[PDB]
Design a protein around this ligand. Structure first.
Ligand SMILES: O=N[O-]
Ligand SMILES: [Zn+2]
Length: 168
């Protein structure tokens, strides 16, 4: 309960209101909706390490208070209150037998998702590759003007937050 450590199934169908609130194009919202990932969560002290298995891709992230978040700011993380926040977005989580339950809050957004424990079915690697490439285009085209979204940032319990660099 107090330790959320485990393996969870995170399907894109469970986060569609969040993707819409991120001002993502219809193609990205729909592509993420067809994808599903396994996220292995390890909570140590005031840190959360995440390994996301998505098609033929592995992504690793670590959630710590003050972690830099790429844009085009910093992550606020309080493990004692099970809260994460950055920019307009905030989230709260709790683990149970039904899995990892997360509430995502922002102006115009109040969405809850529950991610069941276990291992996810494997999304097709062609769909994952097309999704990652389309997210990359959106990020670059949106510089000619939000977070720099990572694929594991959208297909994850703590979306839209993805610390770390664009590389592993
Ligand atoms: O809806 N996938 O382009
Ligand atoms: Zn990443």
């Amino acid at each position: 309960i107090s330790d959320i450590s485990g393996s969870y199934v995170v399907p894109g169908t469970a986060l569609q209101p969040l993707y819409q609130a991120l001002d993502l194009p219809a193609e990205i919202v729909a592509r993420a909706g067809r994808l599903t990932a396994t996220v292995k969560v390890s909570q140590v002290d005031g840190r959360i390490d995440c390994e996301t298995l998505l098609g033929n891709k592995t992504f690793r992230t670590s959630f710590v208070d003050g972690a830099v978040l790429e844009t085009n700011h910093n992550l606020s993380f309080d493990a004692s209150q099970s809260t994460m926040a950055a920019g307009p977005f905030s989230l709260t989580y709790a683990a149970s037998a039904a899995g990892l339950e997360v509430r995502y809050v922002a102006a115009g957004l109040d969405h809850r998702a529950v991610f069941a424990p276990g291992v996810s079915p494997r999304s097709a690697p062609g769909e994952v590759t097309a999704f990652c490439s389309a997210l990359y285009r959106f990020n670059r085209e949106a510089q000619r003007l939000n977070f720099w979204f990572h694929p594991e940032g959208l297909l994850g319990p703590f979306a839209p937050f993805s610390p770390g660099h664009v590389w592993e």
